Amino acid sequence: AASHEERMNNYRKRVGRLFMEQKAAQPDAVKLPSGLVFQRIARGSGKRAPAIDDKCEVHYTGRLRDGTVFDSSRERGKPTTFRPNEVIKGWTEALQLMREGDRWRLFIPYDLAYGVTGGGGMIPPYSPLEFDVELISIKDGGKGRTAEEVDEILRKAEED
């Protein structure tokens, strides 16, 4: 029907918004001004976050709001190499706030993920994404923010 696409995407935006809001409501979840939400799973001992162009070794799992896994380095049995500028916006932001050994759960609203069109395959329009992201190591140990810089950004975010 004529208004079918609109109504379906209205449904998608509603349950997607429900997902994001419930995840943000978790007391230890932190919401950044961009809309990115994260939860720390483990605190790493690394001294530096990656710069935007640093190659990172990452173990991750990506799930939809209903738990469906759409991508996972663990199913492949080895980490994947990423630069923060190669991946979706939510990842780009998060990686630059992570140090070696950090493991975070990310809740990424659609506009920082695959947006209105979706990934074109198993990620439909207006999908928030959940990732479990472990930053294993960084080429040359990392050339981005210092741990102290990262922690101060996070501390202020928490307080706002």
UniProtKB/Swiss-Prot annotation:
It catalyses: [protein]-peptidylproline (omega=180) = [protein]-peptidylproline (omega=0). Keywords: Isomerase, Rotamase, Secreted, Signal, Virulence. The keyword Isomerase applies. Coiled coil: none annotated. Its main location: secreted. GO terms for molecular function: peptidyl-prolyl cis-trans isomerase activity. It comes from the Eukaryota. Residues 53-139 form the PPIase FKBP-type domain. It is found in: Secreted, Extracellular space. GO terms for cellular component: extracellular region. It is an enzyme of class 5 (isomerase). Its EC number is 5.2.1.8. Belongs to the FKBP-type PPIase family. Essential virulence factor associated with macrophage infectivity. Exhibits PPIase activity. This is Macrophage infectivity potentiator. It comes from Trypanosoma cruzi. The gene is MIP. The chain holds residues 33 to 192 of 196 of the full protein.
